[PDB]
Amino acid sequence: DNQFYSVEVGDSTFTVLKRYQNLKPIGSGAQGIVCAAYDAVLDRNVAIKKLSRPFQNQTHAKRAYRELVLMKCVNHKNIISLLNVFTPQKTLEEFQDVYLVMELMDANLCQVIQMELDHERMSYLLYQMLCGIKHLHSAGIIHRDLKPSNIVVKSDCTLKILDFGLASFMMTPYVVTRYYRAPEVILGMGYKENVDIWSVGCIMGEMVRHKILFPGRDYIDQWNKVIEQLGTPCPEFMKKLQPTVRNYVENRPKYAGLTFPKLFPDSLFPADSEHNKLKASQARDLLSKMLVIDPAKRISVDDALQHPYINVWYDPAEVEAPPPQLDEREHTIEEWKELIYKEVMN
Ligand SMILES: Nc1ncnc2c1ncn2[C@@H]1O[C@H](COP(=O)(O)OP(=O)(O)NP(=O)(O)O)[C@@H](O)[C@H]1O
Ligand SMILES: [Mg+2]
Ligand SMILES: [Mg+2]
């Protein structure tokens, strides 16, 4: 008569509620393994992510606690919704795992990057990202860590963002993706809303080029790739850097920079029709306004939404949707356990 059951998925053991049938491993991350499943009660498929011992460290603890609180309060069609939360353990002392249940999407933005997208779908996906990011911004959430792996899509081209971003030692077997972070994060500078526009541009640029824009082993190799293509930023941007960082960037080999038609030629864009020729210029024009190193010269979310390549889908309810305790703090690993439990158990 137990409400839960246990199946072995991959290498781990998933102990889920009886309503969740047939688990198929669909994803895996740093904080948990994601399985797709059927929900008998709701009569639909869902995605179940298992946070194995989230409170084991302050980074993973802060992450888990924050996503849990926001996935409940934030309510937007372009930000993943939480359907059910649960733990198979009965007491705070026995407490080990957390199970996040969300609507099931069909794939990653990484899988969509591997294919040639038409201007209709590319601008719609892009319009959705900016739609959710805008909603997050109105709620006081500035992501700063958007990556394809955390953006999920459905077959009908609907899009949703998975995580809530950045609020940090981690002894782990796995990597962190830096490729989509803004200069005001690579170089530590202090940001504002449009820091997410850079990530959107790194994604669009990859959706077009079909390969990572600014790769690198470290932030040193990555910044190398930023200036090698876009060129050394203007002498007004550098006066905003910290004196120890300013030194490093200023004394770094100079580059004039490539132009956008060179970075993103017409060969990468479908320019057969006359409609596609104009859209291919518009797309390139948006990229040129998103992949700008200086935040003061970088386009805003609102203006990127009013751009001719994106605004063809503008909708008042989707763009200007209404937004909703002060959470950017510090605790020990057992204090976090308590906070996570009392959240999981409303
Ligand atoms: N609701 C969902 N629907 C469909 N697939 C999903 C869903 N949530 C997660 N996945 C997938 O599982 C993968 C990893 O899930 P994720 O939630 O991002 O784990 P994570 O540990 O937080 N990831 P990471 O960014 O590496 O630290 C994603 O790239 C998606 O492919
Ligand atoms: Mg991920
Ligand atoms: Mg994630």
Side-chain angles (χ1 to χ4, degrees), residues 1-13:
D1 213 53
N2 197 341
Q3 295 184 131
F4 305 84
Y5 81 95
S6 300
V7 274
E8 288 74 59
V9 182
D11 237 318
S12 57
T13 293

Side-chain angles (χ1 to χ4, degrees), residues 31 49 63 67 147 149-150 162-163:
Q31 65 173 119
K49 182 190 187 185
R63 184 120 207 156
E67 291 189 315
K147 33 187 177 171
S149 57
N150 301 336
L162 290 184
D163 67 340

